[PDB]
Design a protein around this ligand. Structure first.
Ligand SMILES: CC(=O)N[C@@H]1[C@@H](O[C@@H]2OC(C(=O)O)=C[C@H](O)[C@H]2O)[C@H](O)[C@@H](CO)O[C@@H]1O
Length: 377
């Protein structure tokens, strides 16, 4: 039921590794070809994650070799602090270094992940009680701004805390998760993309976005980050409130899935065929649904409902958005959107969309849960 979908991803990935060399895919821009970078963006870890997933599925060393090479690249990136002045250190190092530790217990990889966690820890702003999303400390406009995607960067910190025994990691992570729950999540179970607080005292200012249609709309990838993010933090923290929030956001998302099963870029714009989609939001949500289900009691009827929703989502992606390995295509699923409002790759491959699509497939076919936490954690 999932073997052919995975087959195409494996073939595309093998072809990509040879063509990309040491470079990393980010997004496409109007074609079936990925635009590459020299490990300088916030998405490079997704490539590493894809390679590790392919390796876990096949046992084929070609994927391992590629992943190991990206890990070496990340060692270099960390040691010269290249473009790491943001909270996406988790996206970058959980899926590469921590991933290798999870896959084969590589000690050097574990150390690299820990070193990265250390850097991310310094993004914490005591006076605001939040992890600064972007920019340097005291940034005039982003000094007290949190983004919902930060929830997916907390796993690196939580994992490091359990590895070192240092309670500060869990302390800042839970504080940030709870603050996110109170101010980023809305009363109708939708969510704001970002939220601003007074850098001095941490007072709540306003919710807003530069990506969603409007400050009060519902950017689908944002909602998706919330679904998977809150579920990942709930697992680590054993916090029933965060799990409940993940479920609430999931139901809100599911109630607004269009006819073909894959979401538009924002729930509050006309849900019309000519509008941009965001297949990556659906891929992320598929993973979040499975993560939520994995935390529910087997006697909870909603558990299977979420598992079925995830399967339906992956099937919808496979049927109407997945690329077949035709020897040319470089992405797994079409129609992801990076920055619609900015006109940046609004109908393209997104490496994160590809990673989550594959993670969902590996979860369904092999029970492989990605690299957000230890297997059995
Ligand atoms: C916020 C930041 O540090 N940089 C901005 C980008 O923020 C990233 O956005 C996304 C996303 O699109 O899903 C995920 C990451 O968690 C988040 O840090 C933002 O995407 C771009 C515009 O697309 O502006 C900044 O680079």
């Amino acid at each position: 039921m999932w073997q052919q979908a995975i087959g195409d991803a494996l073939g595309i990935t093998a072809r990509n590794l040879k063509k990309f060399g040491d470079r990393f895919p980010h997004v496409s821009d109007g074609s079936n070809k990925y635009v590459l970078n020299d490990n300088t963006d916030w998405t490079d870890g997704f490539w590493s994650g894809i390679l590790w997933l392919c390796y876990e599925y096949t046992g084929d060393e070609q994927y391992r070799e590629g992943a190991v090479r990206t890990v070496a690249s990340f060692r270099e990136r960390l040691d010269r602090f290249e473009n790491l002045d943001h909270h996406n250190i988790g996206f970058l190092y959980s899926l590469s270094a921590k991933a290798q530790w999870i896959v084969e217990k590589d000690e050097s990889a574990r150390k690299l992940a820990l070193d990265a966690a250390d850097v991310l820890m310094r993004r914490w702003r005591a006076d605001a009680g939040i992890i600064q999303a972007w920019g340097p400390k005291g940034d005039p406009e982003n000094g007290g701004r949190i983004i919902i995607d930060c929830l997916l960067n907390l796993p690196l910190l939580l994992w490091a805390g359990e590895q070192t025994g240092d309670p500060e990691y869990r302390r800042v992570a839970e504080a940030h998760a709870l603050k996110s729950r109170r101010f980023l999540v809305r009363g109708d179970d939708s969510s704001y993309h970002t939220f601003y607080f007074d850098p001095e005292n941490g007072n709540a200012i306003r919710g807003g976005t530069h990506q969603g249609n409007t400050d009060g709309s519902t950017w689908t990838r944002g909602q998706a980050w919330g679904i998977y993010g809150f579920a990942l933090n709930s697992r680590y923290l054993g916090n029933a409130d965060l799990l409940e929030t993940a479920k609430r956001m999931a139901r809100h998302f599911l109630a607004r899935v269009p006819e073909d099963g894959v979401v538009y870029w924002d729930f509050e714009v006309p849900q019309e065929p000519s509008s941009y989609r965001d297949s990556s939001a659906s891929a992320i949500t598929a993973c979040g649904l499975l993560e939520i289900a994995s935390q529910l009691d087997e006697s909870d009827p909603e558990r299977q409902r979420f598992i079925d929703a995830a399967k339906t989502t992956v099937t919808a992606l496979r049927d109407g958005y997945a690329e077949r390995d035709d020897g040319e295509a470089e992405g797994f699923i079409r129609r992801g959107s990076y920055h619609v409002r900015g006109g940046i790759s609004p109908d393209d491959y997104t490496i994160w969309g590809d990673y989550y699509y594959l993670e969902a497939l590996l979860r369904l076919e092999r029970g492989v849960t990605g690299y957000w936490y230890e297997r059995g954690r």
